[PDB]
């Protein structure tokens, strides 16, 4: 069983497919991070001419000062509509599908060949402080959740995609991954996206290295199948809730 990302846009249909086991369980699909508690300029690229745009030139490509510092351009970019450095904002995701794996739950796979360093998806969710994180830690332990969706954003910001998020919440762990997180600044605000680290052939599952900080007493066995698999999500050591949440 597999599904395409447009299938998640219809809640009534999704929920009906979920009862037939053809789609993952329902969650609230959101377009950007939602803060439970709200918290407290231009590159120097020379504008492409109309002809350069027609010739296939890239606006705000590898040499863009914002891109080099992992900062996205705004609407006021000198390249205007042609700016290729607004991928998070324009939702310029990779072509991926959500698939059911043998024993990791649902997962993500490339629907086309993905070049190296290709933006996959933004890891969206609810952003929590340490206080809200501890409450969610307790709720999810109480509910006996199997999957966890906490992603450290910065010291007192944890992205939680358990209840709200997008299809990035399905990316599974591998000890030999083909994606990575990148922290990108969008409107002075930090975001986390997934990017391929290599050429990912069509049909391959997309994975990244969780660097999981396990606070739970029980370690989840790792089914990544890598020759160098660490055996468990989080490795050997259990850390405290405070340490896992960014101290």
């Amino acid at each position: 069983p597999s599904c395409v990302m447009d299938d998640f846009r219809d809640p009534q249909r999704w929920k009906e497919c979920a009862k037939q086991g053809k789609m993952p369980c329902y969650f609230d699909l959101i377009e950007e991070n939602v803060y439970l508690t709200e918290r407290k300029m231009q590159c120097e690229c020379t504008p492409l001419s109309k002809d350069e745009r027609a010739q296939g030139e890239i606006a705000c490509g590898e040499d863009c000062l914002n891109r080099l510092l992992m900062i996205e351009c705004s609407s006021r970019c000198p390249n205007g509509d042609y700016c290729s450095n607004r991928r998070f904002q324009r939702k310029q995701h990779a072509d991926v599908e959500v698939i059911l794996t043998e024993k990791k739950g649902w997962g993500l796979r490339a629907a086309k060949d993905l070049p190296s360093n290709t933006f996959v998806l933004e890891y969206c969710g609810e952003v929590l402080d340490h206080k809200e994180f501890k409450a969610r830690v307790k709720e999810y332990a109480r509910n006996k959740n199997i999957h966890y969706y906490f992603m450290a954003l910065k010291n007192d910001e944890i992205i939680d995609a358990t209840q709200k998020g997008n299809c990035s919440r399905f990316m599974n762990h591998s000890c030999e991954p083909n994606c990575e997180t990148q922290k990108w600044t969008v409107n002075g605000q930090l975001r986390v996206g997934f990017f391929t680290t290599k050429l990912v052939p069509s049909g391959s599952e997309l994975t990244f290295d969780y660097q999981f900080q396990r606070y739970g007493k029980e370690a989840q066995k790792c089914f990544c199948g890598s020759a160098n698999c660490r055996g468990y999500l989080g490795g050997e050591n259990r850390v405290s809730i405070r340490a896992a949440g960014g101290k």
Binding site: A141, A152, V192, D209, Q213, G216, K217
Partner: peptide, 14 residues
């Protein structure tokens, strides 16, 4: 003292 939880930690792939 929960059962199986934890937090994923962004890092650049090395």
């Amino acid at each position: 003292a929960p059962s199986t939880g934890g937090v994923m930690k962004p890092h650049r792939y090395r």
